[PDB]
Design a protein around this nucleic acid. Sequence first.
RNA 1: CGGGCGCAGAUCUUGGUGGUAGUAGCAAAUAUUCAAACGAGAGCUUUGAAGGCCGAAGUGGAGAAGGGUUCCAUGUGAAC
Lengths: 152, 107, 49, 65
Amino acid sequence: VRYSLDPENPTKSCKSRGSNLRVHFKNTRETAQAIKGMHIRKANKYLKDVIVKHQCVPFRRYNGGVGRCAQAKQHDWTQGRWPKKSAEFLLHMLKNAESNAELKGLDVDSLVIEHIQVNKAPKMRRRTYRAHGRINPYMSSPCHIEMILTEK
Amino acid sequence: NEVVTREYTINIHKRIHGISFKRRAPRALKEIRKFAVKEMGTPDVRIDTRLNKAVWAKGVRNVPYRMRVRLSRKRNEDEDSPNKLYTLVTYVPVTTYKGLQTVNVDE
Amino acid sequence: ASHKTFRIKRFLAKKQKQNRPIPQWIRMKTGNKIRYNSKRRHWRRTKLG
Amino acid sequence: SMLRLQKRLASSVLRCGKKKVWLDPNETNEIANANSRQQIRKLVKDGLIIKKPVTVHSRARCRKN
RNA sequence: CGGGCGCAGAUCUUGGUGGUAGUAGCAAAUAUUCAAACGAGAGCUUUGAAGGCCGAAGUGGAGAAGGGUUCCAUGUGAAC
Ligand SMILES: [Mg+2]
Ligand SMILES: [Mg+2]
Ligand SMILES: [Mg+2]
Ligand SMILES: [Mg+2]
Ligand SMILES: [Mg+2]
């Protein structure tokens, strides 16, 4: 509902949305930037390899403290991790977008991820217990995810 | 053929060398499972419970130095799993390990 | 404690019957004005005194 | 399923600890239908629930010493 | 004509949001492992087997004070 970057041709495009998803926003934004411009089948093979840690997700922006890996050189980057949580939620949304292209009547084998963004959702409220009788906020960072897939 | 069964001698002593006392027996089964994947080129290794008793026979830290093991590659026959085959790993009680070669068994 | 007075047990009986959530048909009555029972207490996080 | 009610009911029927209650792994679906002490007693009479024997604490060495 | 009439500051008030930061951290009391079951989903549930610990000044079995339904069965798996 009210996507950003409305498609160039809405007839050859399928959309998928997700709100209040309990993935980490920083881990998901880096995962979403990895699958952008990939085919629907290449994005699935890439995300399925991140879960089994066969290729990494390069952490470009939120890279403070993340470690280095040998798989990061594939992306001309030094830092990379394997956000299994972010790979599964994005894999569940690619499955929904592929099923939306079927209901619309699109060639699913020709889909390419045109637009994909991850917003910040309202943070969830939990608390941790610190020293000297203090309570600090233990806040979740959920995310809104949307994506546009087009034919090529 | 596809369905095959051989007997191996896993030198567990050199695979758990340098492991803490509380992890020598759990690491041995992870090395036995890795051994079955390496030799029998099939994931989804199923370790017989009698073999779990054999590795844990002398506690968590005193693992037997070697283990006579029979690797039986079978078909899953369910088609619910992606792996068509699986390696059923059993225990072979032997009196001595001297001269035990890798041999195939009959069906 | 197992040893209770009749006044304490009668007091705990009232609080035990108020710790019930609102009926579902209440939200259809007041136009979703009362969304939940804001007086729900848990036996750990809030004591009775 | 979760055989926690049957593990508890059998320990009170057999008058043993929960560490001595043996539930048949092959008949886990049959024991799961037992929701009362009377049905547990029937499973014991059928041999599906047995009291495991006490771990041996032989006094042979001390009696030898 | 009448004002509770103009803010950047007051370790201002209230509310909201950042960088730090996917960071510190989730390191006291020896221990888990195999298989199976249910299940969309299992290192963590259950069952069995194995190997361990508490070792009767128990990590055991029952009370007092205090708690007040936390007891028990079933269901759910949003939130915690
Ligand atoms: Mg305090
Ligand atoms: Mg308290
Ligand atoms: Mg003023
Ligand atoms: Mg101001
Ligand atoms: Mg009740």
